[PDB]
């Protein structure tokens, strides 16, 4: 039931950019979800020890969370918006895969995902 090292948030040789779409992903998308009453389970990697989920990392092999995403955005880790959008979708999908319909954690993810979809719908044109 040990925890893996977190997903990478720093890699100097990896290519990155600062673009208007990525700026929107930080200023609008992340900020909106981060402040939500249901954000707290998703603000850091799943701690399988603390949450007593010893099978978690036997099932979820591409873990993702908003703490990781926040650091990726703030530390200019990404090349493009698609990469960051994929991280959010991974985070939601992991939750749905591991858990059961109507679990509280799933209801929480669904509420965050609703807002995510609304904001991604208005992702600005690349400048
Ligand atoms: C609501 C609950 C208690 C029950 C619980 O641990 N369920 C499993 C679980 N899946 C998760 N996916 C992402 C983040 C946290 C997660 N926890 N406190 N998390």
User: What domains, with CATH codes, occur in the chain?
Assistant: 20-121 (1.20.920.10)
Q: Is 109 in the pocket of ligand 1 (CB under 6 A)?
A: no
8 Å CB contact between 8 and 45: no
Rounded Cα distance between 66 and 43, Å, is 5
Is the sign of the CA dihedral 9, 15, 18, 22 positive or negative?
negative
Q: Which atom of ligand 1 is nearest to the CA of 52?
A: 6
Rounded Cα distance between 76 and 24, Å, is 13
Alpha carbon nearest to ligand 1 atom 1, residue: 105
Helix (H) or strand (E) holding 105, with range, is helix 104-121
- Using alpha carbons, select from 71, 66, 55, 67 the residue that is nearest to residue 3: 55
Q: Is 39 in the pocket of ligand 1 (CB under 6 A)?
A: no
Q: Which atom of ligand 1 is nearest to the CA of 95?
A: 12
Resolution in A: 1.5
For tokens 């939500």, the residue is 36
Query: For residue 43, what are its two tokens?
Result: 């603000």
Query: For residue 103, what are its two tokens?
Result: 């679990």
End-to-end CA distance of the chain: 45
Burial class (CB in 10 A: 0-12, 13-18, 19+), 72: buried
Q: Would you mind telling me the total number of residues written for the chain in this entry?
A: 127
Q: Is 59 in the pocket of ligand 1 (CB under 6 A)?
A: no
């Amino acid at each position: 039931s040990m925890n893996p090292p977190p997903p990478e948030t720093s890699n100097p040789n990896k290519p990155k950019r600062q673009t208007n779409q990525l700026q929107y992903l930080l200023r609008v998308v992340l900020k909106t979800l981060w402040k939500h009453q249901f954000a707290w389970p998703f603000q850091q990697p799943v701690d399988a020890v603390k949450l007593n989920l010893p099978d978690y990392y036997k099932i979820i092999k591409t873990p993702m969370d908003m703490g990781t995403i926040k650091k990726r955005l703030e530390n200019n880790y990404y090349w493009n918006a698609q990469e960051c959008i994929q991280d959010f979708n991974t985070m939601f999908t992991n939750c749905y895969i591991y858990n059961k319909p109507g679990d509280d954690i799933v209801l929480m993810a669904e509420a965050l995902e609703k807002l995510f979809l609304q904001k991604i719908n208005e992702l600005p044109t690349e400048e």
